[PDB]
Amino acid sequence: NRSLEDFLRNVINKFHRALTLRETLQVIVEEARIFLGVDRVKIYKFASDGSGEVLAEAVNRAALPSLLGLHFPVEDIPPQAREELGNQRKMIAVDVAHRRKKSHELSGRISGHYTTVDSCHIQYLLAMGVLSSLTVPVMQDQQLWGIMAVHHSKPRRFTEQEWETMALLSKEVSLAITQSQLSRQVHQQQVQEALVQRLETTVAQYGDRPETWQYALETVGQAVEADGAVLYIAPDLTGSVAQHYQWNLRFDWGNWLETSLWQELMRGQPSANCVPHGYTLGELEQRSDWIAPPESLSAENFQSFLIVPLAADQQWVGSLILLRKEKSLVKHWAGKRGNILPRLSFEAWEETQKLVPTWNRSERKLAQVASTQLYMAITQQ
Amino acid sequence: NRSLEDFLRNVINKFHRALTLRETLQVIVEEARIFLGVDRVKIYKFASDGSGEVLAEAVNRAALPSLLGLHFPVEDIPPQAREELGNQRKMIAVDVAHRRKKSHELSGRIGHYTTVDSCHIQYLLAMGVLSSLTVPVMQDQQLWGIMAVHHSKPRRFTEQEWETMALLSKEVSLAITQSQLSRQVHQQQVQEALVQRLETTVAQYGDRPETWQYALETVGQAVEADGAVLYIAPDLTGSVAQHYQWNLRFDWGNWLETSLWQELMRGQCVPHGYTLGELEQRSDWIAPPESLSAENFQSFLIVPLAADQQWVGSLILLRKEKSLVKHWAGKRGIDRRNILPRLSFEAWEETQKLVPTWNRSERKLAQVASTQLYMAI
């Protein structure tokens, strides 16, 4: 007999009333650095393409540089090393001055063997001013989420007491990542429900008037974090012209929406139940029925479209159109990357990248739930 | 630059100060029952043998009975059901009155029915249950247990409720991980505090024989043994074969000189476990007096204090037979357990006898203390 909105709030109040993920990573590296008495302890998180970022860092600035916020390319860690770190779950200790390494299991020991290090990784570590390195794999969903990096500018051997402690801290990071990922999912459930309740109240208050649909559309566009949005309402029983509503736009899509192109698009039909389908601008232009929009239309940098038909079997009543502009992202890399020899400079290199917007799992679900509500509201609930 | 003792206490203070595992399961089931408005929500944890226990429960007592603390046997949940819940991670809903079921993925979210086996139908009817939702609880990609949602009346669960239960299952899984990691850190302190306790008694209390008695009781308490034996091999040419005892009635001075224990205290500092049944079936086996066997020691953890060449002593950690009592939900038959379901789930109390084992934490701890003593004398 308790509402969902009240229930989700109780989950966070009791199970997710903690610190953020970033703040937790920061606490962990500082405790490791003090306990080890080393120059630098970092936490590095892989991206999908194998590259990564330094998310947390405790560092003696007099001894080592700060790599916080810097990105490293995929080639820095070759498949051989990733295999040993992830699938074998090996912590790796590199003794630079003697060009040797050793591996201990992240799991346990129940009881060291030295191996010669490749000359590239030796120069690499030298270029960093590092003579002692301990790489600790961070696991999540049986995958290498990233590493914990312990660096010292002087020769430094680690006792087993220190191995086990870093292995323990690795599980703490894994714990926090799990915590943060679940708290994210709960919060997405709150946003979903808050959108539904807001839409229901809007209709109950205003009814079947343009103010309802204008307010509802931009409420949805804001929840799904789009850059712009359009709600199209088809002619009802015995004809009722056509209604369209816009948010964060500049020109009237009214005439453009009546095009053969958009009538097919809004229904989710190719030829060129509220299942949202994503599109890029470059894909729509390749349609056989593609008709160019006005001049000051394509200059708004709108590149990503999420079109959701307002339908239910033999009943199509309209469509929800969510838009996203091309975004410019800045990444600071450690040295100039963009082969056989390692780079010997790790200075901050700035790069700007025009990324094509994507509609993730949560946003697509949110758009589905939103359009479903819109369908039920249009057919007079 | 920091000691280990200070570090581990900071880890617990900063990451492990919250509700216990038991308290969290009880919070979770109570929120689930109130939210769903059903008669009973339970959390059920599997043992290694396939059986399980109702750890937490929220129940409308005027609608359904209480199963809190009760054990259910392995036969109740057949291999195929464990496969669906575990490796396939299926949430299973049973509509008893129509003898049908539908399955949904624990993580899948964006409706088909199948006939339920007649046995599981009788089973749920015997419980007074007409509507059931079984949600797998995972840990390390293994089926840790289930969350059981039971209603006496027919009840179809909406999509919003499926996701919500799935979310609570992830919450349970999180609390389990936190609990286990909290246990590891605590066992790290026990191992640490043992060492510092010994070292304060080594370089300060001299080489008095009273030290080997205090270290024996300190280690014995840390490993939570019922009795401890420290055997000192003859020193140099021919000193004296000594032995210290803790919580040991009779004197094992004679039995230790036997080739039975002489071979056991030399391996063949890695700890190794033995049950009494193993010793009795040994080709090398000589019986002890009745006064020694009257204490009923069944589990032996022998840790040879040696480094290849030099073998100066051996550590023997002992545990008596344990008696565990189980409250089975209904009386189990002597045979034909997979043939017919029980129709009565009244608490049947059975006492069990078992030989205690030595887990990874205790064997690691026994190894730490043993090496600590080897370098001592």
Ligand SMILES: *[C@H](C)[C@H]1/C(=C/c2[nH]c(/C=C3N=C(/C=C4\NC(=O)C(CC)=C4C)C(C)=C\3CCC(=O)O)c(CCC(=O)O)c2C)NC(=O)[C@@H]1C
């Ligand atoms: C040589 C042309 C190329 C190359 C090869 C290479 N790398 C490794 C091992 C590792 N390199 C890293 C990189 C990092 N360590 C860090 O701390 C950070 C920042 C947080 C980065 C980006 C890691 C983690 C490993 C694995 C663990 C280790 O310490 O070795 C090897 C293997 C070494 C060996 O054989 O012993 C090789 C061959 N590195 C380059 O940059 C070139 C492109």
Ligand SMILES: *[C@H](C)[C@H]1/C(=C/c2[nH]c(/C=C3N=C(/C=C4\NC(=O)C(CC)=C4C)C(C)=C\3CCC(=O)O)c(CCC(=O)O)c2C)NC(=O)[C@@H]1C
């Ligand atoms: C028949 C002779 C034997 C038998 C077989 C059987 N069981 C199932 C399905 C399940 N049975 C359980 C048991 C429990 N449910 C609970 O809620 C609790 C907590 C107190 C227990 C111990 C579970 C979890 C399942 C799986 C999920 C489900 O609801 O189905 C089946 C499969 C049913 C099917 O056809 O799908 C079968 C064949 N059960 C017996 O007890 C007999 C000894």
Ligand SMILES: N[C@@H](CCC(=O)O)C(=O)O
């Ligand atoms: N060797 C794999 C990674 C294996 C792992 O994740 O453990 C790679 O380079 O992508």
